[PDB]
Design a binder for this molecule. Structure first.
Ligand SMILES: Nc1ncnc2c1ncn2[C@@H]1O[C@H](COP(=O)(O)OP(=O)(O)O)[C@@H](O)[C@H]1O
Ligand SMILES: CCSc1nnc(NC(=O)OC)s1
Ligand SMILES: [Mg+2]
Ligand SMILES: [Mg+2]
Length: 265
């Protein structure tokens, strides 16, 4: 259906391991969108074709205000192109670098939006498994949208593919290559809540080997400025035993979340 000739390409929006993402406009409708470009040679080399097909299949069928749309795809013998909803206010990652830390209202609102999106995903037994600031985008009204579904699967699951970069957002069961389920996303939600308030993730270290140790032992501490409510929520989420982590309804109804969020469930 769609082909490259149908679009005018513009400003580079960002780069990922495989993804090279551009602003683009469809010629006859003037529709503005984002084009995620993948090189076939790199995909074949890394053996991640199944990850691409998952991304397309899972993301194109989901419909939620806090989840980024995928409209379709095409391909041209060196490249694969994913047609995405354009997020005009950028990434949460960039926003965090701008401000250093988020205040409690901003943090609680983001967490509410994430939990709503994840609740929708989990109701289809879809687990994202790669929730981190560079994969959280911002809509025109500043609302958070989950993106990058290349690592997503149906639960329960093992990990069939190599862990690439940072360990910072992954729970013990996944770093230790064990069996895992929906509760992995809830661990990541705790990591994010901490990073939003503090400015860095709670298990950060200088080496892979040391980060690994801090995660498997759940070794984190709080700076003095983190309030009691925030500490309670974060401590509930960062549990070694997955079954002990709260349900998303508990997150959305937590007193600190209700006191500080500006959006509802
Ligand atoms: N729809 C979009 N709108 C605006 N920027 C985007 C969009 N999609 C991706 N980006 C930017 O490109 C980067 C990489 O996109 P992503 O889909 O995460 O690629 P990868 O799968 O390689 O991680 C993102 O971190 C973001 O900065
Ligand atoms: C250049 C094609 S962009 C596109 N295709 N289909 C769409 N559907 C849509 O907006 O549904 C809400 S947007
Ligand atoms: Mg990404
Ligand atoms: Mg990806």
């Amino acid at each position: 259906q769609w082909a490259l000739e149908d679009f005018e390409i513009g400003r580079p929006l960002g780069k990922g391991k495989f993804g090279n993402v551009y602003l683009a406009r469809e010629k006859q409708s003037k529709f503005i969108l984002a084009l995620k470009v993948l090189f076939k040679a790199q995909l074949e080399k890394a053996g991640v074709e199944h990850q691409l097909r998952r991304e397309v299949e899972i993301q194109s069928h989901l419909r939620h205000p806090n989840i980024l749309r995928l409209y379709g795809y095409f391909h041209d013998a060196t490249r694969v192109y994913l047609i995405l909803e354009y997020a005009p206010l950028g990434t949460v990652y960039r926003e965090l670098q701008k401000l250093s830390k988020f205040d409690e209202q901003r943090t609680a609102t983001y967490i509410t939006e994430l939990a709503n999106a994840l609740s929708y995903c989990h109701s289809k037994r879809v687990i994202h498994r790669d929730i981190k600031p560079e994969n959280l985008l911002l809509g025109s009204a500043g609302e958070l949208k989950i993106a990058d579904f290349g690592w997503s699967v149906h639960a329960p699951s093992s990990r069939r593919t190599t862990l690439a970069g940072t360990l910072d957002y992954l729970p013990p069961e996944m770093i230790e290559g064990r069996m895992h389920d929906e509760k992995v996303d809830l661990w990541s939600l705790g990591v994010l809540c901490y990073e939003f308030l503090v400015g860095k993730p709670p298990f950060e270290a200088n080496t892979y080997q040391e980060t690994y140790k801090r995660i498997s032992r759940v070794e984190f501490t709080f700076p003095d400025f983190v309030t009691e409510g925030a500490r309670d929520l974060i401590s509930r989420l960062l549990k070694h035993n997955p079954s002990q982590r709260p349900m998303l309804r508990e997150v959305l109804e937590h007193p600190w979340i209700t006191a500080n969020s500006s959006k509802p469930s």
